[PDB]
Design an enzyme around this catalytic site. Structure first.
Site, PDB file in Angstrom:
ATOM      1  N   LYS A  62       1.414  54.086   4.879  1.00  0.00           N
ATOM      2  CA  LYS A  62       2.097  53.495   3.303  1.00  0.00           C
ATOM      3  C   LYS A  62       1.313  53.343   2.177  1.00  0.00           C
ATOM      4  O   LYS A  62       1.952  53.650   1.328  1.00  0.00           O
ATOM      5  CB  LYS A  62       2.858  52.101   3.921  1.00  0.00           C
ATOM      6  CG  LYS A  62       2.218  51.104   4.871  1.00  0.00           C
ATOM      7  CD  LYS A  62       3.030  49.918   5.297  1.00  0.00           C
ATOM      8  CE  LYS A  62       2.398  49.202   6.440  1.00  0.00           C
ATOM      9  NZ  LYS A  62       3.407  48.129   7.150  1.00  0.00           N
ATOM     10  N   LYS A  94      -3.151  38.915  10.316  1.00  0.00           N
ATOM     11  CA  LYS A  94      -2.167  39.056   9.247  1.00  0.00           C
ATOM     12  C   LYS A  94      -0.677  39.036   9.951  1.00  0.00           C
ATOM     13  O   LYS A  94      -0.365  39.927  10.742  1.00  0.00           O
ATOM     14  CB  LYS A  94      -2.143  39.911   8.410  1.00  0.00           C
ATOM     15  CG  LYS A  94      -1.138  40.518   7.628  1.00  0.00           C
ATOM     16  CD  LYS A  94      -1.514  41.831   6.503  1.00  0.00           C
ATOM     17  CE  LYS A  94      -0.180  42.519   6.099  1.00  0.00           C
ATOM     18  NZ  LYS A  94       1.223  41.925   5.834  1.00  0.00           N
ATOM     19  N   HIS A 106      -0.276  40.326  -1.463  1.00  0.00           N
ATOM     20  CA  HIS A 106       0.560  41.696  -0.737  1.00  0.00           C
ATOM     21  C   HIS A 106       0.762  42.339  -1.822  1.00  0.00           C
ATOM     22  O   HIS A 106       1.067  41.870  -2.979  1.00  0.00           O
ATOM     23  CB  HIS A 106       1.547  41.334   0.245  1.00  0.00           C
ATOM     24  CG  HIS A 106       1.896  42.252   0.949  1.00  0.00           C
ATOM     25  ND1 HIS A 106       0.519  42.919   1.659  1.00  0.00           N
ATOM     26  CD2 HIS A 106       2.965  42.925   1.517  1.00  0.00           C
ATOM     27  CE1 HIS A 106       1.354  44.102   2.544  1.00  0.00           C
ATOM     28  NE2 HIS A 106       2.536  43.914   2.285  1.00  0.00           N
ATOM     29  N   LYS A 132       1.700  43.586  14.846  1.00  0.00           N
ATOM     30  CA  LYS A 132       2.931  44.477  14.952  1.00  0.00           C
ATOM     31  C   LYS A 132       3.148  44.209  16.466  1.00  0.00           C
ATOM     32  O   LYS A 132       2.129  43.844  17.140  1.00  0.00           O
ATOM     33  CB  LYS A 132       2.316  45.978  14.406  1.00  0.00           C
ATOM     34  CG  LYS A 132       1.171  46.663  15.272  1.00  0.00           C
ATOM     35  CD  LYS A 132       1.400  47.161  16.647  1.00  0.00           C
ATOM     36  CE  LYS A 132       0.544  48.187  17.176  1.00  0.00           C
ATOM     37  NZ  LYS A 132       0.550  48.599  18.512  1.00  0.00           N
ATOM     38  N   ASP A 186       3.576  40.290   8.861  1.00  0.00           N
ATOM     39  CA  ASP A 186       4.450  41.186   8.088  1.00  0.00           C
ATOM     40  C   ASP A 186       5.681  40.105   7.679  1.00  0.00           C
ATOM     41  O   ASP A 186       6.113  39.166   8.170  1.00  0.00           O
ATOM     42  CB  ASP A 186       4.571  42.207   8.713  1.00  0.00           C
ATOM     43  CG  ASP A 186       3.616  43.476   8.127  1.00  0.00           C
ATOM     44  OD1 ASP A 186       3.076  43.166   7.479  1.00  0.00           O
ATOM     45  OD2 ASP A 186       3.895  44.556   8.750  1.00  0.00           O
ATOM     46  N   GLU A 187       6.281  40.957   6.821  1.00  0.00           N
ATOM     47  CA  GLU A 187       7.699  40.169   6.458  1.00  0.00           C
ATOM     48  C   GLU A 187       8.581  39.855   7.381  1.00  0.00           C
ATOM     49  O   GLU A 187       9.289  38.884   7.070  1.00  0.00           O
ATOM     50  CB  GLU A 187       8.279  41.110   5.178  1.00  0.00           C
ATOM     51  CG  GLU A 187       8.801  42.503   5.799  1.00  0.00           C
ATOM     52  CD  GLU A 187       7.882  43.327   6.552  1.00  0.00           C
ATOM     53  OE1 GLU A 187       8.012  43.388   7.862  1.00  0.00           O
ATOM     54  OE2 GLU A 187       7.231  43.936   5.881  1.00  0.00           O
TER      55      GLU A 187
END
Lengths: 469, 132, 469, 157, 156, 469
Positions: free
Chosen positions: F328, F195, F288, F169, F197-198
């Site tokens: 989330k 990792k 995911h 992030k 993210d989209e």
């Protein structure tokens, strides 16, 4: 008739139409020799002629429409037949076929014509194949070994003593890192080549692809850390031809040297296609064989070892499997030594004392290498070396994975016994009588072989002589 | 028992897992090998050229593809064609040994029926590393 | 143990390690039932257990390294065994395997594990496979018939009587225009389907490709000029898989109706790949069968008809070959009816009176249609219809190409006899006793059948009941 | 020799090494029959033997390294030759080759070996090919006619 | 490399030489002094020995027969074949390793075979050596056929 | 009726045609358990039977044309139903289907039949899926995980503690070289896996291709300079399947280790095909999962956690997403532990206390690895380790990218806390109470962890117990 005959209704006597004991063979003719026992009441020349007639023409009522085909020199012929001394109703039948009748080098057409149609008849009690004459024009339209013995010697970059290995067990389901450890240790200990079995290749959880990746890490270091040329026979088994081709092509990416396939338990044309592919990609190809108590041991009633060796070499293979001595495959002197001679050597005439009734002409035919496996080790090494020399490709089943000091001292003990036997053999020793004392002397300091000979102190079997079918 | 691992030195192929052979043992085995119809050749190889490699895969686009490197041996002047005298072979081994301290000297032979070469005894050089 | 056992050297007794007569099966377990005779001096529980041990793990000396694999539920188990009343040394062995031991739907791995490894042993005199339990998860990872009976019935656009045919002979070498003439005349005369033999397909000058072009010219008119749906089973045989694929793909271009192959005389994985190809291309697939004296007839020593029917359907085929009545394949009442029942039908339990020892659970497994061939015609149609009904696919070899008035009156006589028997069967007659007089009544004016019944006036054979192997 | 000969430095007479007038052919042997006239000063058996030697092995100085190959049954052989009764210096040469020497069914290898190498020599005034024995195993690895006369008759309708 | 002629040798015996004795002869003569060696038609392929394996022994030998000498050298493979598919297979497998210069008697086989190969050689950036043979039935035809200058024009 | 029933015009009651509370299920039957509340005036046996009728056959007025299909054993059946204790209008429905009704392993046909058609009905107020029985033959025609836990443990070459990571992030837009620096520093600090993210994957200016090249540059040294196996999960998201395949294939050329995809937020068959490709190319595949308030939290009105875990594993994945603890996704004991058991484990029968109503037959079903992410760090490491052991794949969100001394001391603090917790676990400490003092003991000289515990001084949270949907 060369065609155009108005045959009267019924079936003509086979002895008046397919029997010719004065026949002069062609160099293009295909001949087959069979051992047979008719059902009670049928003459053996009526039976022999009927087998020749049904495998060539066939009838259940003949009229003018059977006159449509050209019969003349194009039909199969039954030659002179003889009685068998062991059983009064057993006879040896000799049948000739011309080249005209078969597609050129076509293995399912030849197989179905010669074995499929022939080995069926209800008025025939038992029938055994004894020999085959394959003419040169069918031998060369066949492909034979892709990379035979005179190629394989220069390709493997080592030779001068037998090629030492081991068959990896348990067959069930061994974890990939524990398999990687076992394979690495036995190759680093002194084996030349290791081998997989059918269940070792793939299991529900574990794919061949990842088992192969543990082989790739292991093989790189099992040459790199040892200096000596070594590898591992992948066994590569599958359910469909797409899966077989996928298994081939993914291992083409790494281009590994020698592998094996049991593919010839799967299908004859599958192995033939692979041997062509192996020839095309410059591989080395080991051929597996099994089904010994239902194919190979068909006593007076079917397949035999010499015809099996001819059939196996007339598809092809560079290595070929071959007696376990004890357990599941052959170990007999009157079985193995002919079988190996028909695989190793070229340009040699027929002999009835060796059960050869026909010569297939020879010259430029590659040799193919027997792979034995090898149920008893240390004390049976003398007899094995004296009988077979520098044939084999000895893949142990007791050795290595039977040594309680582990895979490296197990492999080292088997390697020490091979080198000690080869030194005794290099001195020209009387190996059958000297070999026990050679092993006792070797044990003074190899400690690994001393442990091998304390661990295996109950095994002393050599070989039996006479067939045990 | 038992710790197994080649320490400081490696297993240089066939006849390296046993104690070394003497010239008398070699001559007796050569005389037998000559009697059995094999034809000897004396050959030698640099220390990093007698130990198997795959580094040369860097030059080529399709690998491994059965390719190998650093296993080729260079011949000592002549193969043993015609004369088969083991003392000539022993003098040639000494002459080879004197010529190259850093390279290994070995005997090989062939069977002319199938023209196949046998790689025999013994991997030796003046700087030979630790005995096992 | 699930792994970690420090075993001492030796081979442990199989009756204490691979024999469990208290075991209860899982739904995912694979079971096999075998008929066996040990060598003299070998306990049958040692033999049964040894077979289970060698097909599971295998050993010629076990130490702590065999402790590396997870044995527990994963190993093969020999269940309780029974005597056979046929001989004092014959027994039925029952061996269970879990799903874990074999690759999913892997036919060469399953074949090599179950038959290859097992049917070898030198301490085993004879071994015959009696039954198999194939669990649903292995039945559906198998592929089975691509277009079996519930598909083939709607696909062929006709049904309500048997499917009438003939096997085209002589096997030797018939030229393409005389073959084209014979095929056209017999199909236009009354046959539904004709069949090739292995040599008919391709010969030295005449390629399959050109034989196929004469088939295409003939077949268009041999439907168009007769109105009725008919065709010809091409056979399609080949020496290599590249040749098989070439044979497939060139006939995809014309997209011809139903063909057959001796591919399953060639090999199991060749046929499995083809059955997938047939499933993909919307074909119908007829399967050939041969080698009856060395496979099918293996008395107490190998393969049997019920296991053969299970094995054939567990690769797959939509039609499958099957008794010649007389000559080269079976004709016995206690042989054919089980063999056909295991091919035709679904959802049915095991019975020892039918020789069934295991039930493979069923529901959604398509049927497969027997093809008989057919050495005797006219008088044996009543018994054939009474025994098998509207099964078959009856391919004559005496009929049609045995009629002295040619292919058209031959085919017409066989068609008249087929329809006359079917009308007698539709009237609910006592067909076994009425049928001779029904045929005689039919002959009043079909002259073609009158000539058929004078020409074939001595063939009155039915079937023998009890097996002749 | 089957390999391992320590030949003396120089060129050995071809008539003592590649010419054998009592040779017996195999069913797999490839034979060629040639009509020839040597250059003046060259014996016809030297010429026949030299043609067999140059199409088989070749040399321009032989030493122990020519001993590396397996000569034995694997080399080409010139068989017994005859005069042509139409011209005094013309002869018919008969040369045999084993199956071992050529690639199986390879047209440029057979062509280059039989015609390419042979029909060049400065010691040959003229050389004409008269016949060939193609053994059955090379006849069937040749591909031959695709749709010959017994196919073409039915194909043209 | 240039400034003197290009030094080589024609490999004989034409018959049939086994791969390790061929490997030894090629390594030794290149390491001794030669720039380029050449194969004959029978040296390329034999019943027991595939071109594919002869090429792999050439690859091991050629790598060290430059690397251990310090001078740029190679070997002319002769490439000969029975069908154009065999010719293309022979081309494409040696394209994978993109070896320096080879030769072909392709132009004893056929004119359009050599023309197609020369285009392929141009496309793949190689170098192409051309064989010549049949001197008594082509080149030497006195008043009655082909001559050297027309042959040189036709070849170029 | 087996077929051919002329039903009277109208609608026969579903309770008289699709309700059979005495039914005995087959081993090949597909069973479903649903929690339901009908609309007022609809009987629950009418609702269950109507659901079974509409998912099986369907009608809006039945006449003789519904007689054209075979119904007998081929139609869906509503079994015995039970009340829900929580609400007077809630019931649990149990519906059985034969194997015959659905295409073999056909995910959109099974999904559309079972969920698509069923979860629509106007007179149904709410319907929630509670369990599913997937018979072994449909489990094996499904493909499941490509490289499950028993493959993945040996493939990742490191195991014996949890797998430590962090989720990268800000999601917006971070330039490739500052991302390359952050990824290199946190991997060099002690993370095992990072990792994407989209949005991190691809942005208007910055292509996935160039982001991948910065990952490649970083990853070579982020193993090479640290001497420990580590990597980075690329997330690889896309607009079309051609783009998904392009994203797969370009990273196959360099064959990078492990990646993830939200492909299974895109589509079920997209993920299934990719998992087959991942199996084929020998990779490892992280899956995911998102959409927690509109799928996972569907109270009494749709999807639930145990069926979600079964559905996710019945497409497949090697790792699979799983609680964020806060934010989330889930963090609850009665949610996570069942969900994780249904992913990790095999061979375990049904229990109503664990919400399991149906057992799918077990034996050879690949495991799949939970991935948590992980918002709170240091003080919740004890509780996490004590609850979950050496499951996870813990990808922090506060850890690493929340440390004001930068990515290497952030990652180092998380690594020190992981090793300190694992040492406490290895000493057999009472981790829930001892772990705080272990963290204090560690802080004496790791300064990085001292800074971590001052920075995160207010978070002492464990987990909540009860599902808060």
């Amino acid at each position: 008739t060369k065609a155009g005959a108005g045959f009267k209704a019924g079936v003509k006597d086979y002895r008046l139409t397919y029997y010719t004991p004065d026949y002069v063979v062609r160099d293009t003719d295909i001949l087959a020799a069979f051992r047979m026992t008719p059902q009670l009441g049928v003459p053996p020349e009526e039976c022999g002629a009927a087998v020749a007639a049904e495998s060539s023409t066939g009838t259940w009522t003949t009229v003018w429409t059977d006159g449509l085909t050209s019969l003349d020199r194009y039909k199969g012929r039954c030659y002179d037949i003889e009685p068998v001394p062991g059983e009064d109703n057993q006879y040896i039948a000799y049948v000739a076929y011309p080249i005209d009748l078969f597609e050129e080098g076509s293995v399912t057409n030849m197989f179905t014509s010669i074995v499929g149609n022939v080995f069926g008849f209800k008025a025939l009690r038992a029938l055994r194949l004894e020999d085959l004459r394959i003419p040169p024009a069918y031998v060369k339209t066949f492909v034979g070994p892709p990379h035979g013995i005179q190629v394989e010697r220069d390709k493997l970059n080592k030779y001068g003593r037998g090629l030492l290995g081991c068959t990896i067990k348990p067959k069930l389901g061994l974890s990939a890192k524990n398999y990687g450890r076992a394979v690495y240790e036995c190759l680093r200990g002194g084996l030349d080549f290791t081998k997989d079995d059918e269940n070792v290749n793939s299991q529900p959880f574990m794919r061949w692809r990842d088992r192969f990746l543990f082989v790739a890490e292991a093989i790189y270091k099992a040459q790199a850390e040892t200096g000596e040329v070594k590898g591992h026979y992948l066994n590569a088994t599958a359910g469909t031809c797409e899966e077989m081709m996928k298994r081939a092509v993914c291992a083409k990416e790494l281009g590994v040297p020698i592998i094996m396939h049991d593919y010839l338990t799967g299908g004859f044309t599958a192995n033939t296609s692979l041997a062509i592919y192996c020839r095309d990609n410059g591989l080395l190809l080991h051929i597996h064989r099994a089904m010994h108590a239902v194919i190979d041991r068909q006593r007076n009633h079917g397949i035999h070892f010499r015809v099996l060796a001819k059939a196996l070499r007339m598809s092809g293979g560079d290595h070929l499997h071959s007696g376990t001595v004890v357990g599941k495959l052959e170990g007999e002197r009157e079985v193995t030594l002919g079988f190996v001679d028909l695989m190793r050597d070229d340009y040699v005439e027929k002999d009835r004392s060796r059960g050869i009734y026909f010569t297939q002409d020879w010259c430029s035919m590659p040799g193919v290498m027997p792979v034995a496996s090898g149920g008893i080790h240390v004390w049976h090494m003398p007899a094995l070396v004296e009988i077979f020399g520098d044939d084999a490709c000895l893949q142990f089943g007791g050795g290595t994975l039977g040594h309680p000091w582990g895979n490296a001292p197990g492999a080292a003990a088997n390697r020490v016994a091979l080198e000690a036997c080869t030194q005794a053999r290099n001195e020209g020793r009387d190996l059958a009588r000297e070999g026990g004392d050679v092993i006792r002397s070797a044990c003074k300091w190899s400690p690994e072989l001393a442990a091998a000979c304390e661990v295996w102190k109950e095994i002393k079997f050599e070989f039996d002589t006479i067939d045990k079918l | 028992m038992m710790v197994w691992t080649p320490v400081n030195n490696k297993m240089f192929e066939t006849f390296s897992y046993l104690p070394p052979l003497t010239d008398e043992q070699i001559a007796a085995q050569v005389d037998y090998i000559v009697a059995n119809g094999w034809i000897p050749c004396l050959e030698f190889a640099e220390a990093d050229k007698a130990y198997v490699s795959n580094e040369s895969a860097i030059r080529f686009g399709s690998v491994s593809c059965l390719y190998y490197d650093n296993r080729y041996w260079t011949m000592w002047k002549l193969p043993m064609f015609g004369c088969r005298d083991p003392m000539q072979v022993l003098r040639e081994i000494v002459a080879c040994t004197k010529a190259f301290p850093d390279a290994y000297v070995r005997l090989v032979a062939f069977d002319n029926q199938k023209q196949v070469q046998i790689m025999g005894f013994l991997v030796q050089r003046p700087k030979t590393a630790r005995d096992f």
